[PDB]
């Protein structure tokens, strides 16, 4: 049973706490689908949230402390000394659009039947591995590197080690979620995360609005900027 697998996974994550579902979301019938499909959805959502939160935390240290690529690019319109909430606000509108669009294409490839079937897998709600990004083996143009393990460092890793790695992924993703929203919360309700008192600056602007402020409308292309 998918619930039994989830409870065992929770025990692996933390045997002191074990399975901790105070709302019974694992028993909620999302979309009227059975418990196995709903648990697949919830595990995929947990892993996805955790992954993106870990990337968000590392990128918060990168942007706020000051870590930029050189050359012509979106980096040249963000003011120096800008804080992590102003970096996204300051990049060009096309940069925001194309970042979100590329993330969307990756989501689409993640849930497409074509790639998951070419990799001999199924959708995470239809008896598949929750949190599996397929190789780009069904994209039209042959694609150099895959998303997960692009250099294939885990081509020969034990299944037990992979299971432990997924157990690590869930826990570290949860903790990264807590830290990243600690950073966000300290800027819109000061004195909420006591350690960050005085570190994170206040930010006047809706975090959850992606395209506000719209940012500059510059044209950063140089050679062949006929569209300007």
């Amino acid at each position: 049973s998918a619930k039994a697998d989830l409870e065992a996974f929770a025990k692996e994550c933390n045997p002191v706490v074990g399975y901790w579902d105070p709302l019974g979301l694992a028993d909620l019938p999302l979309w009227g689908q059975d418990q196995d499909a709903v648990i697949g959805w919830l595990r995929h959502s947990e892993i996805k949230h955790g992954r993106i939160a870990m990337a968000g935390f590392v990128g918060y240290i990168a942007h706020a402390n000051g870590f930029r690529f050189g050359g012509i690019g979106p980096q040249n319109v963000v003011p120096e000394g800008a804080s992590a909430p102003e970096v996204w606000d300051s990049i060009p509108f096309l940069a925001k659009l194309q970042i979100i669009g590329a993330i969307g294409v990756l989501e689409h490839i993640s849930e497409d039947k074509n790639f998951l079937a070419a990799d001999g897998m199924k959708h995470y709600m239809r008896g598949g591995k929750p949190g599996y990004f397929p190789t780009f083996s069904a994209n039209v143009h042959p694609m150099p590197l895959n998303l997960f393990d692009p250099f294939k460092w885990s081509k020969n890793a034990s299944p037990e080690k992979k299971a432990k790695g997924l157990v690590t992924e869930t826990n570290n993703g949860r903790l990264a979620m807590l830290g990243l929203f600690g950073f966000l919360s300290e800027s819109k309700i000061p004195g909420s995360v006591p350690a960050l008192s005085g570190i994170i600056p206040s930010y006047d602007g809706d975090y959850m609005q992606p395209f506000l402020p719209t940012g500059p409308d510059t044209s950063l292309w140089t050679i062949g900027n006929l569209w300007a």
Partner: protein, 211 residues
């Protein structure tokens, strides 16, 4: 190489220490008084981590003793009689000028940037020659994390297939056989000594830096 870049463990096949009992044996051998002093409990780890800690301790011992002797010499002011720059149409700088720059930290600071880069490059070359598993296995050992002796520097002079394109005259450790043949366990006595004076030189060099 890509088959060995596993990021994971493989079974050990040597008598190197891979447990707390083995660590305790070496601990009493180093010093019967203290024994194993592991408050953080980094003996309760995997064989690869134990070997990693052992090699890290040994390497800190090497660098710390070398640093302490270099600090003492540079404080004594026994500079070199050569010129350190100015042969390919560059400015002239002398080891006397480097010495007169100040204390040994100031001397390193006064050292020119490409000189620093070249020194660090040689040290990195030595480091990766140490880490090369293929070189150790052409020689008689493995990577310290995967059951090798912690501290072994492979020979830089050789005629095997894994030999440099140009012949190298001598090796890093024991270039002229000053070790020659210690007895089969007097080498181990010297290893115990090395760990002890390495720890002492570690404390000494950090104390001097603090002062």
């Amino acid at each position: 190489f890509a088959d060995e870049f596993t990021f994971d463990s493989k079974p050990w096949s040597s008598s190197e220490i891979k447990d707390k009992a083995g660590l305790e044996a070496l601990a009493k051998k180093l010093n019967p008084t203290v024994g194993l002093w592991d408050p953080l409990g980094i003996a309760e780890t995997s064989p690869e981590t134990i070997g990693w800690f052992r090699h890290a301790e040994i390497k800190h011992g090497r660098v710390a003793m070398a640093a302490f002797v270099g600090y003492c010499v540079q404080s004594n002011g026994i500079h070199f009689p050569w010129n350190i720059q100015g042969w390919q149409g560059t400015p002239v700088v002398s080891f006397a000028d480097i010495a007169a720059a100040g204390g040994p930290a100031d001397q390193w600071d006064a050292l020119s940037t490409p000189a620093k880069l070249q020194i660090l490059g040689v040290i990195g070359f030595l480091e990766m020659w140490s880490e090369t598993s293929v070189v150790l296995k052409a020689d008689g050992q493995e990577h310290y994390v995967r059951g090798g002796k912690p501290g072994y520097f492979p020979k830089l002079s050789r005629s095997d297939e894994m030999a440099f394109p140009h012949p190298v005259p001598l090796n890093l450790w024991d270039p002229f056989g000053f070790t020659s043949k210690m007895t089969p366990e007097r080498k181990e006595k010297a290893l115990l000594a090395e760990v002890n004076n390495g720890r002492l030189a570690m404390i000494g060099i950090f104390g001097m830096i603090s002062a």
